[PDB]
Amino acid sequence: MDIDPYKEFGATVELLSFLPSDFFPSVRDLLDTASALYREALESPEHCSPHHTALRQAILCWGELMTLATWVGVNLEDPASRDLVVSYVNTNMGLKFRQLLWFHISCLTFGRETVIEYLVSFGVWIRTPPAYRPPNAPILSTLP
Amino acid sequence: MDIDPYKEFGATVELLSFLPSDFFPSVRDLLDTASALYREALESPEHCSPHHTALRQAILCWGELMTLATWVGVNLEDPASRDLVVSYVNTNMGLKFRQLLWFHISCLTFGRETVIEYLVSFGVWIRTPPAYRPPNAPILSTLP
Amino acid sequence: MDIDPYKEFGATVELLSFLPSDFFPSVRDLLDTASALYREALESPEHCSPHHTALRQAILCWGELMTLATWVGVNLEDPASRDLVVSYVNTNMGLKFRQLLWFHISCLTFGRETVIEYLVSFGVWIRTPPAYRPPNAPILSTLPETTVVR
Amino acid sequence: MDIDPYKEFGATVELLSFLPSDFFPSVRDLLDTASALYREALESPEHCSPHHTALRQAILCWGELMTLATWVGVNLEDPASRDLVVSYVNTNMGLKFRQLLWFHISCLTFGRETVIEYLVSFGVWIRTPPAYRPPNAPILSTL
């Protein structure tokens, strides 16, 4: 099964590649935003939304990966190898889950259509070469 | 954040641990069942069901966990350690994911209420002394 | 004060004295059935049923007995004495609390009248001599004789 | 499970911790009161009240604990460890069970709301410093 966790919603892994890897906030900041804005909804026993379901699952997924990495590192005896494996994790699983959490939190806060239009607009902005790129990058906001 | 994944479906980790650990089919068997029965639905751009969303997320998480495991295993060179770490990841993460995939596949196939009643019935059955319980173990079936 | 814990429910200790020890699941299995089936109602702040009240009190006192026995054993210095106290508790209080928890869980699941009818039938079966009673004991279950869920 | 034996009624263990450990009457006095006032109600085949159910269970299971304690003491070696066992049984199980018996008997006799109000009032009384603490400790009464 070649499953794309976004085509269920309307985006694709290549639509989120418009945003660079250095754009997404850290996992700590994303989970803090989740606990701040959507905590009661996430622990509610209701199917509040597909975004809520996917977000619950993703949070538990990162919990499992962090448990595994912590146990492996605790049993590990070589700190250089520990740094290498934590860099590998943060590079691949870290980036993938930062993408997932950014997408779901933003679709909950501002809206799925707005998030997809923002993806297209930021793709345009980041494709435009710097000499002709506006200093005001596009951003999701509920204010003028 | 204290997220219980089964809660939004009406179940609990206490209810899925109410069944034995060696009852749940292997992760390969469950993934094969998923690919054989609901591949076109898991790869389709539709919120077919909360079970479909949770199943997509669980499959992707198992892929990521196995990716981390095989990467660290290929980079390491200790066979006893391979055995220890594979046993650890199995008995914890593989058990959690066996419970998850079993629950979701069985729900999609038979019914959420049917799966919950099966949980309670099979638990009481395994706990009842043999001479005072029905001789055959309970099992879910589509054939009338 | 000559209190019968089942009398308020219409059963009696003489009616539950026919069920053999092998008929009841272990105290751990019964407490697990409770925790997995009616935990939300047993921890709730509202009276749900006389069975729920009696079951709460039974679980609490089983815990207290267990803590007492654990303290006694930890203090004690003889392995044979530890085995003896464990055997005594498991044959005197273990069986009684198995009876109580089984009764209340089964009344919550199936029904009080159904448990009482099953007790009468099991009494007949268990008092009938072996060469004259059917080989399979009467069964109180939530499943048919095929044990296949659809 | 975290079953609180008073939660279904309206009190908690945090609420009953207001009263000290030396305040509750002895199990003998509590069982004598229970007998004299509600023997026919606790021996009757009726769910007269959740308080009656809890009181029946408490009486029988305290008798169970006493049977275990007497067997252990009869089998034990020396009066030193015997009195140590008895002191442990008292300070923990006897205290908890006279808490339970006091709560349910007082509820049955005066009223559940009255018992909870009495708990709050006794908390206030026991927190007030002695120089300003009245000698008339709060007491449950009908007349």
For residue C9, give the nearest of C141, C94, C111 by alpha carbon. C111
B42, A80 Cβ separation under 8 angstroms:
no
Which residue range is the domain that position D107 belongs to?
1-143
C140, C129, C109, C104: which is closest to C23 by C-alpha?
C140
* Distances in whole angstroms, Cα of residue A42 to Cα of each of A56, A58, A112, B10, C28: 6, 11, 18, 14, 33
| Angstrom distance (rounded) from CA C69 to CA C55 | 21
What does the H/E/C string look like for B33-99? HHHHHCHHHHCCCCCCCHHHHHHHHHHHHHHHHHHHHHHHHHHCCCHHHHHHHHHHHHHHHHHHHHH
* Residues C47, D50: Cα–Cα separation, whole Å: 8
Distance (Å, rounded) from C-alpha B42 to C-alpha B101? 13
Q: Which of B104, B39, B27 is nearest to B63 (CA)?
A: B27
Chain D touches chain A, with at least 3 Cβ pairs below 8 Å, answer no
Cα gap B16→B115, rounded to integer Å? 10
CA distances to A10, A54, A67, B9 from A49, rounded to whole Å, are 15, 9, 27, 13
C149: phi then psi, degrees, rounded to nearest 5: -95, 140
Distance CA D12, CA B114 (A): 38
> Residue D130 carries which DSSP code?
G
* Phi, psi for D34 (deg, rounded to 5): -55, -50
Tell which A residues from 78 to 97 touch B, by Cβ distance under 8 Å: 81, 85, 88-89, 92-93, 96
CA–CA separation, C103 and C10 (whole Å): 12
| B12 neighbors B6 (Cβ within 8 angstroms) | yes
Please report the resolution in angstroms: 3.0
| Distance (Å) of CA B57 to CA A55, D33, D92 | 9, 62, 50
d(CA D43, CA D10): 26
Q: How far is B114 from chain A (nearest CA, A)?
A: 19
Please list, in sequence order, all residues whose beta carbon lies within 8 angstroms of the beta carbon of residue C49, skipping any fewer than 6 positions away: C108
Burial letters C36-64, b for 16+ CB under 10 A, else e = bbbbebbeeeeebbbbbbbbbbbbbbbeb
State whether the Cα torsion C94-C99-C100-C102 is positive or negative.
positive
Radius of gyration of chain D (CA): 17
Cβ distance C27 to C94 under 8 Å? Answer: yes
For chain C, the C-alpha Rg in angstroms (whole number) is 18
Chain centroid to CA C5: 12
> What CATH number is attached to the domain comprising A115?
1.10.4090.10
d(CA C106, CA B132): 14
Give me the phi and psi of C81, to 5 degrees please. -65, -40
**In a 3-state reduction of DSSP, which class is residue C43?**
coil
Burial class (CB in 10 A: 0-12, 13-18, 19+), B77: exposed
Return d(Cα D40, Cα D117) in angstroms, integer: 28
Q: List CB contacts of D86: < 8 A, sequence separation 6 or more.
A: D69, D73
Q: Helices D95-110 and D27-42 meet at what angle, rounded to 10?
A: 50
The contacts of residue A136 (CB under 8 Å, 6+ apart) are: none
SS3 content of chain A, % helix, strand, coil (to 5): 65, 0, 35
Residue C10 zone, left/alpha/beta (φ > 0; ψ -120 to 50; rest): left
Reported as half-sphere exposure (CB side, CA atoms, 13 A), residue B80 has a value of 0
- Token pair for D37: 């006032």
Task: Calculate ∠ Cα C16-C17-C23, nearest 5°.
Answer: 75
Rounded CA gap, C40 and D1, in Å? 10
CB A89 within 8 A of CB B68: yes
**B114 part of contact set with chain C, CB < 8 Å:** yes
Cβ C45 vs Cβ D7: under 8 Å: yes
CA distance D27 to D97: 8
Cβ pair A86, B86 in contact under 8 A:
no
Are chains A and C in touch, 3+ Cβ pairs below 8 Å?
A: no
> Residue D85 and residue C75: Cα distance in Å, rounded?
9
Contacts of B136 in chain C (CB under 8 A): 146-148
Distance, in Å, from the CA atom of D131 to the CA atom of C20, rounded to the nearest integer, reads 63
Burial label for C33, CB within 10 Å (0-12, 13-18, 19+), is: buried
CB distance from C36 to chain B under 8 Å?
Answer: yes
SS3 of residue A144 by DSSP: coil
CA A140 to chain centre: 15
Give me the residue label for tokens 């089919």: B25
> For D129, left (φ over 0), alpha (ψ -120 to 50), or beta?
beta
Indicate the number of domains in chain B.
Answer: 1
Q: In chain D, count H helices and then E strands.
A: 6, 0
Is residue D56 within 8 A of residue D42, CB to CB? The reply is yes
> Do the Cβ atoms of D92 and C59 come within 8 Å?
no
Q: Are the C-beta atoms of D39 and C95 separated by less than 8 Å?
A: no
- How far is Cα C2 from Cα D39, in angstroms, rounded to an integer? 9
Q: Which residues of B touch C142 (CB under 8 A)?
A: 117, 120-121, 124
Place of tokens 């990966």: A65
Tokens of A86: 């934590």
Of B10, B46, B57, the CB nearest to A61: B57
List, in order, residues 6 or more apart from A128 with CB less than 8 Å away: A134
Residue bearing tokens 């034995």: B20
Half-sphere exposure of residue A50: CA atoms within 13 angstroms, side-chain side: 22
CB contact under 8 A, C147 and B127: no
> Which method, experimentally, gave rise to this model?
cryo-EM
Contact call for residues D31 and D59 (beta carbons, < 8 A): yes
**Cα separations (Å) of C82 from C61, C88, D136?**
21, 10, 50
Q: Do chains B and C touch (3 or more CB pairs under 8 A)?
A: yes
